[PDB]
Every structure is written in C-alpha cells, then in structure tokens.
Design a protein around this motif. Structure first.
Motif, short mmCIF file in Angstrom:
data_model
loop_
_atom_site.label_atom_id
_atom_site.label_comp_id
_atom_site.label_asym_id
_atom_site.label_seq_id
_atom_site.Cartn_x
_atom_site.Cartn_y
_atom_site.Cartn_z
N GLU A 62 38.31 -36.97 23.70
CA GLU A 62 39.17 -36.98 22.51
C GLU A 62 38.46 -36.53 21.24
N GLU A 67 39.84 -34.46 8.98
CA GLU A 67 40.99 -33.57 9.17
C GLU A 67 41.92 -33.56 7.96
N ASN A 68 42.21 -34.70 7.34
CA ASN A 68 42.99 -34.62 6.10
C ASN A 68 42.34 -33.83 5.03
N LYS A 85 38.44 -32.65 18.82
CA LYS A 85 38.72 -32.57 17.40
C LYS A 85 37.63 -31.86 16.73
N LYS A 92 37.59 -41.40 25.30
CA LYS A 92 37.47 -41.31 23.87
C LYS A 92 36.41 -40.34 23.40
N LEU A 118 35.52 -41.78 15.39
CA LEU A 118 36.96 -41.53 15.28
C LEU A 118 37.53 -41.71 13.90
N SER A 119 37.09 -42.77 13.22
CA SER A 119 37.50 -43.01 11.83
C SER A 119 37.09 -41.94 10.82
N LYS A 120 35.98 -41.24 11.09
CA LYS A 120 35.57 -40.18 10.23
C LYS A 120 36.39 -38.96 10.45
N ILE A 121 36.57 -38.63 11.72
CA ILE A 121 37.30 -37.42 12.10
C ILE A 121 38.65 -37.33 11.42
N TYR A 122 39.38 -38.41 11.44
CA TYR A 122 40.74 -38.42 10.86
C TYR A 122 40.85 -38.35 9.36
N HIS A 123 39.89 -38.89 8.61
CA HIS A 123 39.97 -38.56 7.21
C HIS A 123 39.41 -37.17 6.90
#
Lengths: 81, 84, 81
Positions: free
Chosen positions: A69, C78-79, A73, A66, C71-76
């Motif tokens: 991963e 990227e949006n 990003k 992770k 991980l939760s930060k990365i994905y919003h």
C-alpha cells in the motif's frame, strides 16, 4: 496332610491367575505414554493461546500488505513531484 | 509324602519370588506413565508442523523491520524534497 | 508338619498382598494416557520455544508503529501536492 496338599493346589491356581494378569497388565502398560516422552499441561500452551503457522502467515501479511500500500503511493508521489 | 509337599512348596516359592519382582518393576514403570489428567490430548494441541517457534518469528519480524526502515528513508526524502 | 502349615500361611499372606497390588495397578493403569491420544515431546514445542497470542500482538505493535508513522505522512503529502 490332606489339607496342606489341597492348599498347595489352591495356591498354585492363584499363582497361575496372577501370572495371567501380569501378562495382560504389561500389554496395557506398553500402550501408555511415558511421562518422559510428553510435556505436561504446565509445559505447554493450549490451542486457544497460540497462533498456528497460517495465523502467523496472516498476521505477517497484514504487515506486508500495508507495506505494499505505501509502496504504491510513494512512487506515484515521487513521480508527481 | 512330606518331601513331596516340600517340593511343590519350593516350586511355588520360585514363582512367588518372580511375581514379586515383576510387581515392583511394573509399579516403577506405572510411575513413569503420564496421567491423562496431567496432559492435553492431540485435540487440545497443535503439532510442531502447525507452529512457528520464537526464533523463526523473531527472524521473520526483523526482516519486516528492515523493509520498514527502507520505506522510512524514502518518506523522509520525499518530505524534504517537497519542503523546497 | 506345624512348620509346613506355617509356611503355607506365609505364602497365602504373600499371595494376598500380591493380589491387592495387582488390583491397584489395574486402577492406576486405567488413569494413564494412551500414547495414541497424545503427542510426544518430539511432535511438539514447549512453552519456552513459543510466543503466545499476546506476546505476538506485543511484538507486532512496534512494527505497526512504524507503518502508522509512514502512512500518516503520505496522506498529508499527497494533499500538499
């Protein structure tokens, strides 16, 4: 008198046999584990309650995976900025 | 042959004294052996070679928390960058 | 003569008891662990030097926290791009 002499011989025989048993016992004793050189069941956890080295290396890699991963990003995201 | 009987008696006694000593020693030694009931077999256990200790784990983990810290600081900065 | 016969009987008594001890010892011997079938204290770590599965699963959850944080930060983010 004849009886005492006979009993002496009978005792000697018993003594010979006891000495033979003792030698045998000592041989078997020496194949047993000294409680000093072992932990009891109370000083130990069983297989079922423990992770081996590989199971630990796996659990740790799960974390590193992770991390990787996220590293992939981050550097895409900074380059996207 | 009373003297002669008495001589064999003495021989016996000496053997007896020794047997009694051996018995006492054996019983002491027996009491230092482990009952198979009170121990796990080799099949119920892992050896030293197949396990990590607490400190080796505490070590590995704090190494992991160091990288996590590092990555947190890149994220913080990326949030603040975007922000403006 | 009565004294010799009396000592003989004393010896026989000792012999009786030794024989009983021998049989007992053999019984106890048979309940002991063979050193072949056990690891010594040197082939093992004690309870005190090891984490169980749950102690490990516990220690790991603090690390998984921080991973989830990122991980939760990365994905919003990227949006957000």
């Amino acid at each position: 008198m004849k009886q005492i002499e006979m009993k002496i011989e009978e005792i000697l025989s018993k003594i010979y046999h006891i000495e033979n048993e003792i030698a045998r016992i000592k041989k078997l004793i020496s194949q047993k584990a000294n409680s000093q050189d072992v932990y009891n069941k109370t000083d130990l956890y069983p297989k079922t309650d423990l992770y081996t080295k590989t199971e630990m290396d796996t659990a740790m890699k799960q974390i590193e995976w992770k991390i990787e991963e996220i590293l992939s990003k981050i550097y895409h995201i900074e380059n996207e900025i």
